[PDB]
Amino acid sequence: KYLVQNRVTGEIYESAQFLYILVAACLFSNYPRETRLQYVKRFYDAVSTFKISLPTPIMSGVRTPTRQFSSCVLIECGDSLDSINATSSAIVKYVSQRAGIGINAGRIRALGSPFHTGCIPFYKHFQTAVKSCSQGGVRGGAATLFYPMWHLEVESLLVLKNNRGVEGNRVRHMDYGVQINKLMYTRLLKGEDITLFSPSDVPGLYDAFFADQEEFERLYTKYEKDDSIRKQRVKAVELFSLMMQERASTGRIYIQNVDHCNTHSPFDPAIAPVRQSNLALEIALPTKPLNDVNDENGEIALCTLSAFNLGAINNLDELEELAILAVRALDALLDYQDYPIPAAKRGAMGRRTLGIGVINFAYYLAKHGKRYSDGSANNLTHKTFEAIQYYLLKASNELAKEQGACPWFNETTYAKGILPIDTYKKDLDTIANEPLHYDWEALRESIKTHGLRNSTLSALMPSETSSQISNATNGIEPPRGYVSIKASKDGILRQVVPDYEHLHDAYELLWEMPGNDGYLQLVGIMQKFIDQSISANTNYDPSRFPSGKVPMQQLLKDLLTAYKFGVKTLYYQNTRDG
Amino acid sequence: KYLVQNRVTGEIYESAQFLYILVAACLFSNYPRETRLQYVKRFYDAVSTFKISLPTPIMSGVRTPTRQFSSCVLIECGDSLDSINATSSAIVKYVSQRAGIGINAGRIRALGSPFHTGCIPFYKHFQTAVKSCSQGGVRGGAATLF
Amino acid sequence: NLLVTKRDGSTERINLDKIHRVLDWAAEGLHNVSISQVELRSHIQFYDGIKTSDIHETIIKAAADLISRDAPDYQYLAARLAIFHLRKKAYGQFEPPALYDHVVKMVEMGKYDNHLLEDYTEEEFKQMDTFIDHDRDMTFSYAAVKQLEGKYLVQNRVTGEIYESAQFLYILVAACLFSNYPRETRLQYVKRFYDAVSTFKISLPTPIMSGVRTPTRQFSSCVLIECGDSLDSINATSSAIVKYVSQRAGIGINAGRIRALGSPFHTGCIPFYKHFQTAVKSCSQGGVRGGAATLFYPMWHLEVESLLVLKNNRGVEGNRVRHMDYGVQINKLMYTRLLKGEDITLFSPSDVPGLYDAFFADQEEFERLYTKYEKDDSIRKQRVKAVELFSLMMQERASTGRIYIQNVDHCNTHSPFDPAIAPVRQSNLALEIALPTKPLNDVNDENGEIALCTLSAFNLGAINNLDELEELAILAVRALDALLDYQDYPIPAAKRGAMGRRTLGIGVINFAYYLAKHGKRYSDGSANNLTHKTFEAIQYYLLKASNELAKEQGACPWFNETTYAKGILPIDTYKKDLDTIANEPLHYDWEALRESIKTHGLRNSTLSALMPSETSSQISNATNGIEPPRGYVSIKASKDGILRQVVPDYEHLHDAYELLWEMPGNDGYLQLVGIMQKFIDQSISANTNYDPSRFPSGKVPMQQLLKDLLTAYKFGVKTLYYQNTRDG
Amino acid sequence: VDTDDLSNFQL
Incomplete structure (x- = not known):
């Protein structure tokens, strides 16, 4: 539900960094050249590093x-x-x-x-x-x-x-x-x-x-x-x-x-x-x-x-x-x-x-x-x-x-x-x-x-x-719980809470x-x-x-x-x- | 359903021939004063005799x-x-x-x-x-x- | 600051030290019980203007919820906290009044039988008061204290008022059953029957x-x-x-x-x-x-x-x-x-x-x-x-x-x-x-x-x-x-x-x-x-x-x-x-x-x-x-929460059972x-x-x-x- | 529900 794709053929056209850079580009498009690209770079960094x-x-x-x-x-x-x-x-x-x-x-x-x-x-x-x-x-x-x-x-x-x-x-x-x-x-x-x-x-x-x-x-x-x-x-x-x-x-x-x-x-x-x-x-x-x-x-x-x-x-x-x-x-x-x-x-x-x-x-x-x-x-x-x-x-x-x-x-x-x-x-x-x-x-x-x-x-x-x-x-x-289970036609999707290895008791x-x-x-x-x-x-x-x-x-x-x-x-x- | 009345006090204010005559009088109110009451009487007659x-x-x-x-x-x-x-x-x-x-x-x-x-x-x-x-x-x- | 509404009906500064002391007194000689844990689980439930009675209910229940096979001594911590609450409810303080003074007051209220006064002199109540060891109350388990409070202790059925404590119950039960014995042997019979029932x-x-x-x-x-x-x-x-x-x-x-x-x-x-x-x-x-x-x-x-x-x-x-x-x-x-x-x-x-x-x-x-x-x-x-x-x-x-x-x-x-x-x-x-x-x-x-x-x-x-x-x-x-x-x-x-x-x-x-x-x-x-x-x-x-x-x-x-x-x-x-x-x-x-x-x-x-x-x-x-x-733990329901009991001396005998x-x-x-x-x-x-x-x-x-x-x-x-x- | 138990609470 993120990547630009063909809804009917199932074709994927892009990857996650193109998504991130361009989302930065459109939101800062109207900024003055002076500061525009610097704003784009730092917003991209912030979202691509979560x-x-x-x-x-x-x-x-x-x-x-x-x-x-x-x-x-x-x-x-x-x-x-x-x-x-x-x-x-x-x-x-x-x-x-x-x-x-x-x-x-x-x-x-x-x-x-x-x-x-x-x-x-x-x-x-x-x-x-x-x-x-x-x-x-x-x-x-x-x-x-x-x-x-x-x-x-x-x-x-x-x-x-x-x-x-x-x-x-x-x-x-x-x-x-x-x-x-x-x-x-x-x-x-x-x-x-x-x-x-x-x-x-x-x-x-x-x-x-x-x-x-x-x-x-x-x-x-x-x-x-x-x-x-x-x-x-x-x-x-x-x-x-x-x-x-x-x-x-x-x-x-x-x-x-x-x-x-x-x-x-x-x-x-x-x-x-x-x-x-x-x-x-x-x-x-x-x-x-x-x-x-x-x-x-x-x-x-x-x-x-x-x-x-x-x-x-x-x-x-x-x-x-x-x-x-x-x-x-x-x-x-x-x-x-x-x-x-x-x-x-x-x-x-x-x-x-x-x-x-x-x-x-x-x-x-x-x-x-x-x-x-x-x-x-x-x-x-x-x-x-x-x-x-x-x-x-x-x-x-x-x-x-x-x-x-x-x-x-x-x-x-x-x-x-x-x-x-x-x-x-x-x-x-x-x-x-x-x-x-x-x-x-x-x-x-x-x-x-x-x-x-x-x-x-x-x-x-x-x-x-x-x-x-x-x-x-x-x-x-x-x-x-430590593991979150989700269904999808692709099989069972699992997620493990971040840094479970070091923090299981801390949670x-x-x-x-x-x-x-x-x-x-x-x-x-x-x-x-x-x-x-x-x-x-x-x-x-x-x-x-x-x-x-x-x-x-x-x-x-x-x-x-x-x-x-x-x-x-x-x-x-x-x-x-x- | 038909005669003017109170919802709450359930009191009834008119009889049928007043209903019939006034429906006529309302509908034909804009007619010229040379045909108006003639139309009112003939319409009143048509409805009150069913x-x-x-x-x-x-x-x-x-x-x-x-x-x-x-x-x-x-x-x-x-x-x-x-x-x-x-x-x-x-x-x-x-x-x-x-x-x-x-x-x-x-x-x-x-x-x-x-x-x-x-x-x-x-x-x-x-x-x-x-x-x-x-x-x-x-x-x-x-x-x-x- | 946190304020507490007293017995009568007026605020006062919360006293975290007094609470800690009661807990520390309650924990004496117990093993595997964290006062700190009970403190955390109950303090979070407090609020500005809390009735003083509800603080005790919260600490008791907090200790009661920790009763387990691993930590069975919470049975006695919660119990003692409840005994401490019952004393303050019955007498306005931890210390029970003198036996004679209590019996007199109670008979007058129509709660104890008036023959107690006929059958015994004040000096005889003074002597009986010396048989009493109120600390025996510290030896009850939590479930025991719930029973005493539910259907034993003389209480007001409608207001929920408790009028007595467990040792008064025990001494007086001894008194009535041996009332007709000759002075020669009467009080000695009372003392030894009290001992036998108060020590289970x-x-x-x-x-x-x-x-x-x-x-x-x-x-x-x-x-x-x-x-x-x-x-x-x-x-x-x-x-x-x-x-x-x-x-x-x-x-x-x-x-x-x-x-x-x-x-x-x-x-x-x-x-x-x-x-x-x-x-x-x-x-x-x-x-x-x-x-x-x-x-x-x-x-x-x-x-x-x-x-x-x-x-x-x-x-x-x-x-x-x-x-x-x-x-x-x-x-x-x-x-x-x-x-x-x-x-x-x-x-x-x-x-x-x-x-x-x-x-x-x-x-x-x-x-x-x-x-x-x-x-x-x-x-x-x-x-x-x-x-x-x-x-x-x-x-x-x-x-x-x-x-x-x-x-x-x-x-x-x-x-x-x-x-x-x-x-x-x-x-x-x-x-x-x-x-x-x-x-x-x-x-x-x-x-x-x-x-x-x-x-x-x-x-x-x-x-x-x-x-x-x-x-x-x-x-x-x-x-x-x-x-x-x-x-x-x-x-x-x-x-x-x-x-x-x-x-x-x-x-x-x-x-x-x-x-x-x-x-x-x-x-x-x-x-x-x-x-x-x-x-x-x-x-x-x-x-x-x-x-x-x-x-x-x-x-x-x-x-x-x-x-x-x-x-x-x-x-x-x-x-x-x-x-x-x-x-x-x-x-x-x-x-x-x-x-x-x-x-x-x-x-x-x-x-x-x-x-x-x-x-x-x-x-x-x-x-x-x-x-x-x-099983090792017995569970009972009550409007006061889940009541647990652990079979005696589980610690040393779990395999023996x-x-x-x-x-x-x-x-x-x-x-x-x-x-x-x-x-x-x-x-x-x-x-x-x-x-x-x-x-x-x-x-x-x-x-x-x-x-x-x-x-x-x-x-x-x-x-x-x-x-x-x-x-x- | 116990109205006495509630009634103490300060809003």
Whole structure:
């Protein structure tokens, strides 16, 4: 899926270094002769020696006649048929180019409102839209759909992929992100009730849920008293129980902490709130609904991705040179790639958002004699991710000085002199004491002055195909075992975790972890520095629990733990089997 | 189905001959004042003695503030994503007003073509559009695909 | 910084040093345990504002999760951490209050019985406080402490409050049982009984462990009821059951006298068995959980074929009574019929006068009457092939595992009771109790007899040699005999049985462990003479204590009905074939004891019975009863996580053990059960065991089932309890 | 689920 080849005859036309050199060439084509080839040489070196990892669409496309490189899109739906249709048409367009979709559909009014018929028929429609270009209707095209926990129709929505219901009650082939904030959790702890409203019956309520927490607090309590308003009342424990139950059995009912996404964010939630995520739960960008597929007032969020290989670098100041290369390569791509829907071009040219993450982290901790589960890797994670975010911000800063900041820069918290080191969850101070090694105060000013080329830089995405290229452990995840097995018509494909020979004892394989606490702390410490979010998983081995049944108590506790350490999103829940 | 009434209080406001006369008065309202009431009387007579049968949407709506009376639409889909999307949007709009649909989807190219993935995924997408405004994707909204 | 929410409800700085100290104190003298490891696994779970109680739960569980064959001392680390948590829960600090101050407070709260204060002076509580060694708490295993916290320690059932610690439980249990002793000897008896139980030499059963010292007087946990062949008797039996199960007793029911379906009980036994079932389950949380029974009947009953399949889960509802266990009753003649490949004749008890009685008491009278009635063809009778009947029984025994065997002849020829006056005609739930009974006409019929038995056990792993049993037997007999006078009796026929015969059942725990440390095994015959040696010591010293007690306090009212009264001893009446498998001679003066018994009699009509123990032996980390363990580590579920127990002294003895499935067959174990029964007054809860994978095609041959049945018979085995089949 | 066990947690 990389080398330029004849799809029908099976002819291969090139080799890996031609791919690498030419990918460098196209991304730096427009640079001045003065510096052009030097940029090409050093970017080639960085990717051919596995220091920078590039995603599939770039790996197979850049240098060919195609300009289709967007692989993740975020679309927000308004509460009207026109918006519903625009959303649907945008999806169809992007999935025919193989993009993964994140859809915010929480604004659609509930069944029985003054969408007399409700959300679900429309969710089915988005499903068919997503699957409209799939080899049979299962293979290819994927989506996660997002909605608030307090939506009137929530109980119906939580079971949407429960494979044991009735057809018109089910939309099984999308994943879901349930959206929560401080107040919902408090209601859980205090053992109280949650009130369910349709968005339409509570003016200003949906907006506050993301932007202003104490405004949300006021309006919620107000509308809980006002008994002319259509409302459903449920026990907080039964709602969270239902969600976590559905999360446990399908493994794909996700969590987004909307307050964390806005209090600790590169965006001012009053002007550009973050209100959803993407397919895999690491992208966090602002959006606006469309009236029409071509509505130049809407905004569809896009993000170009890449990764640093933490196993190919010898020390952390190598990241300076690498961050420069990564930022400038990806920022050039934004100007190179096609945009099939005008609202998406708006998002990309307005904000110039990037998502640059890591691969080979398990390997990295291994060779430093650290582990996931015990807290032994906390200060090293803090040290490592500080270096990453500081050097990314520096590159985008030098680029802003060179080529001008991004059109909508003034909407970032960055523009106001505020940094991630100012807005992070306070409880992270109780679990790591590494101090900052870089001049965050010089950088604050240099940002106040010249701004940033890109509104976001960092996001921790899963990688699977990408990290195979450089024999790397996937993203920030611990491996399941020493050898990874894959099927192909060419026979059984095996991969052995890097430097197994010297490090087999150093690794902490996934199921060796007594619980989730260690890993969730590392995800917290990471999020301190990450612009967007992280694709974090929760994991449970039934055989560590009485009668092989995972207690709800433990599920709820770990959910709250992630919350406690400022975790923005929770992705897959894996259950060991056998 | 026919007499103006309250949904909630279930209270009924008119009798049949008021329905018949006003349907007439509405339809013939723009006629010149030398033929108008003559047409109204003769049409009133035709329907109230069962010689002309009027469809449900007219029978229930003509005289009220609504203007939704189209009960049957026919949409042709072209062989492109732009057209497939337009067809889908139009179906959603019309099924929300309770219209029945005829869709022509013959021009969509077959599985394997240089679209590539075939008609059936697009048919499903028409089906969800058709059912986008009903109970639980089963009752309400009907279509025939050609 | 990390903050901790205290007992009351206010924050405070986390104190990592105090946690480390408690762990270091807990680890004293333990081997192969990493404090550091336990620190890492629990600290990661902490968070800002953590309740102080949850820190202790986290460290305990953290230590508990490390319990393993390689590092078994985590059993004691976790245990001590839990003891330390329980002290702070009960008293607001590690140090228990003074005994008197505690007793006073508790009686006032309605949690301890107020007679404690009447029967003892404050100075007497001061003296008792000096016997107490609270550090004995450090000697419990983790699973032991879970049991204490679950169902022993005086606690608030609803709030979950714990009010006491294990030594207060032990001292006070001693106090109540010796309350009525003369000052001369009273406190010395209390001190030595406390020592014996707090150092695990004597094991006490649940009802005594959780009750004695509280306002309750409900201590009877096993009852034996015999049903007569009338509706009045049927109803009396039913009412007695309901009464006892509401107090949680296990029931043994003899229902073999009820006439068969079609007699001149036109409708038959089964509707009545269903009734006894509902009676047994009348106080059960859903109708499955709690209240248990074994029902007994003769193999030759006319309705037997219907009865054998009663728990076969694949029949029709009115053919099935699934939630009781069954004991099939057999004698020499039935077995002979099997061997000789002949027929067995089935009669209803009602059509054969004198036949049912002889079946238990007089074997050759049974022989005569049986053959007589087999000829007399006016008598309603069914004829079946002996092989098909035994096949059916053993088949049902194999698949449910709970169709039991009682050898009624062995229960009467080798018995502390004269079968002409007081025959043994049934057993209890678990098949170790063997006492006489008489049917009731009414729940309050003062002519009926319901058998009761108070239980206890010697820990064979806590004693250094066999003459320690003298001092221990004295303590056990006198403690249990006092209880008989202390406990309530809700049904007059039961009070009759207990005050008439004063029957006790004192057995063993930790036998597998005991054989292990003597380099002996179960399956090869290597433990025969040691078993003979060990159980001779047990029975001789029990009889001696009950004899000294008879001299001190008078023999039991119905003593004259025992074979003991007639000068006959267990060493006179045992199955003769035991001479072909052991040659240990007798080490004690059985002839002096014979005379001293002829003269002064016994306080108690029975003393010994080998009962299963499960909960009890957990308290002292002991292997269960006389059973070999299944594996080195025993796993249990609880809402507190996975509970592990490691067989005692695994470190030095792993090779010495013979785990259950390591046994090639049943022969070795059945011989040890035989040799034991030589000395046991009552019976033994013996099991049969089969691993399908030792047999062709994984199917256990009936030939082997029948052979082992006959082997048990051959060595004088009275009862056969569970059949376990390995799975997987 | 135990609401008392949860309720201690500080968010």
